[PDB]
Symmetry: none
Subunit: 23 residues, 52 copies
């Protein structure tokens, strides 16, 4: 979905690190 | 379901990290 | 069932992390 | 059975974490 | 059997965690 | 047999944890 | 045999844990 | 998508490290 | 044979644990 | 893509270390 | 042969553990 | 052959453990 | 590519260590 | 390639240690 | 190659230790 | 090769310790 | 080979400790 | 071999400790 | 062998501790 | 064997502690 | 065996602590 | 066994702490 | 068992801390 | 059980800290 | 449960610090 | 929940430090 | 959430240090 | 986000040190 | 980013030390 | 980058010490 | 690079000590 | 390289001590 | 190399102490 | 080597203390 | 070797103390 | 060996203290 | 051995203190 | 053993203090 | 044992302080 | 036990201070 | 227990200071 | 509990200082 | 709680100093 | 909170010194 | 914040010394 | 910031000494 | 920066002493 | 830099003493 | 460098004492 | 170097005392 | 070296006292 | 060495006092 992009700008480190793990 | 999106804005780190593990 | 949603708002970290592991 | 729901409100962390592992 | 339910209210953590692993 | 139930009330943690692994 | 029951009341942890692994 | 490139210039270390793990 | 029973009363932990693995 | 080469001259250590892990 | 019984009373742990693995 | 019996009284642990693995 | 050789003369330790891990 | 030999005379410790890990 | 022998007489400890790890 | 024997009489501790790890 | 026995009488602690690790 | 017994009476602590680790 | 029993009465602490680790 | 019982009354702390680790 | 009970009344702390670790 | 309960009222701290570790 | 509750009102700190570790 | 809540109002620091570790 | 919120307003530092560790 | 925000304005240092550890 | 930014201007040192640990 | 740059000019030492830890 | 270079000329010691830790 | 060389001639001790830690 | 040799003749103690740590 | 030998005759204590740490 | 022997007769204490640490 | 014996009769305390640390 | 016994009668305190540390 | 007993009657304090540390 | 009991009646303080450390 | 009780009535302070450290 | 209670009424300060350290 | 309460009314300072350290 | 409150009104300074250390 | 507030108005310095250490 | 603010206006130095240590 | 600023203008030295320790 | 600059011109020595400790 | 330079010309000794501690 | 050189010619002793501590 | 040499001929004692501390 | 030798003939006591501290 | 021997015949007390501290 | 013996017959007190400190 | 015995009959007080400090 689009929720990933809301996890793209989450101000947390580990969130965006797992995001980039799953793109 | 939609509950994932309620776990999208959970104020916790590890919650949203496992969220981004499962999108 | 619906019990998952009661585990959606459990105030614990690791609970909601395993929740997001299983949605 | 219904015993899972009694393990839904068990005040322990690891109990409810394995609960959410098995819903 | 019913012994599982006696392991449902065992006051130990790891007991009830393996209980919820096997319901 | 019935020996499992004598391992149900064994005062040890890991014993009853493997018990609940095998019910 | 009956030797398992003598391993049922062995005062050791890991013995009775493997006992409950094999009942 | 293009979101990876927005994770290319994320000012965080671990983000870009997982980025380079997944290019 | 009967040697298993001599390994039943071996004063070692890991011996009797593998014994109970094989009864 | 070419984004890897922009991660080639990223001024960070761990970035370029994972870069050289994936060339 | 009978050499197994000489490995039954070997004073080592891991020896007798593999012995009880093979009786 | 008989060489196994010379590996029966080898003063090493892992030797006699693999011996008892193969009798 | 040739980018590896630009990572050959990167002035960092861990970069060149992972370089020599992958030649 | 020949770049390994340029990593043979790199004045760093950890570089040449990973070099000797990969010859 | 022969470069290993040039890493045989490298005056560093950890270099020659990884050398002897790989002969 | 024979280089191991030149690492047998290397005056360093950790060198000869890894030597005896690999004989 | 016989080099192990020359590492048997090496005057160092850690050398002979790894020797006894590998006999 | 018999070299273990020469490591049985080595006057060092850590030597004989690894000896008793490997008998 | 019997050398373990000579390590049973070794006047050192760590020796007999590893002895009791391996009986 | 019976040597464990001679390590049962060894006047040392760490000896009997590893004894009770292995019974 | 019964030696555990003789380690039950050993006047040492760490002995009885490892005893209660293994019951 | 019942020896655990005699370790329940042992007047030592670390004993009862390991007791509660194993119940 | 019920012994845990007798360890619930043990007047010691570390006892009740390990109690709450295992509930 | 309910004993956790009696450990909720235990006047000790470390008790309630491990309580909040396990909720 | 709700007991966490009673540990939210516990007047102790380390209690609320472990609370915020587990939310 | 919202309790985290009540731990956002807790006047303690270590509380808010663990808060920022978990956001 | 936005609470991180309220922890961005918290007048404490260790708060903002853990903030910059998690951005 | 951009909040890191507001932590770039925070007048504190440890803040900017953790900033440079995470860039 | 370029913010690292603004942390290159930060007049503080520990800032530039962590900078050189991450280049 | 080249910023390391500007940290090569930084007049501080600890800066250049961490520089030589990372070359 | 060659910058290490400029850190070889840096007039500081701790600089050259970390230099000799990394050669 | 040969720079180690120039650190062999550096007139400083701690330099040559780290030199002998790395030979 | 032979440089260790030149560090064997270095007139400094700490030099020869680290020498004997590495032989 | 034999250099250890020249460090056996070094007239310094700390030298011979590290010697006896490494025999 | 036998050098330990020459360190047994070294007239220094700290020498013989490290000797008794290593027997 | 027997050298420990010669360190049993060494007239020094710290010698016999380390002796009793290692029995 | 019995040497501990000769260190039981050693007229020194620190000797008997380390004795009671090791019983 | 019983030697602890002879260290129970040793007229020294530090002896009985280490005794009560080990009971 | 009961010896702790004889160390309960030992007229010394440090004895009873270590007693209360171990109850 | 109850001995702690007899150490509650011990007229000494340091006794009751260690008592309150262990409650 | 309640003994802490009797240590709350102990007329000593250091007692109540350790009390407030443990609440 | 509420006892902390009774330690809030204790007329002693060090009491209230440790109080403010634990709030 | 609010008790910190009552420790904000405590007329003592060390109280308010530990207050400002914990804000 | 804002209480720090009331500790900014506290007329005491050590208060404001710990304030500037925590900003 | 800006309060540091108000602690920059505080007329006290130790205040500004801790200020320059934290810039 | 630039405030350090205003602490560079502060007419106090200890201020500028801590300044030169942090440059 | 260059401010260190302005602290090089500061007419104070302790300033230049800390300067030479940090060069 | 070269500023150390200007601190080599500073006419002060403590300056040159810290200089020789850092060479 | 050679500056140490110019600090070798500095006519001051404490200078040459710190010189001999660092050779 | 040889400069130590020129500090061997320095006519000062404290110089030669630090010399004998470092030989 | 032999310089210690020239410090053995140095006519100064404190020299020979530090000599006997280092033998 | 034997030089200690020449420091045994040195006619100075403090010499022989440090001698008896090191025997």
């Amino acid at each position: 979905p689009e929720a990933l992009e809301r996890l793209a700008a989450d101000p947390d480190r580990e969130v965006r690190a797992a995001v980039a793990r799953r793109l």
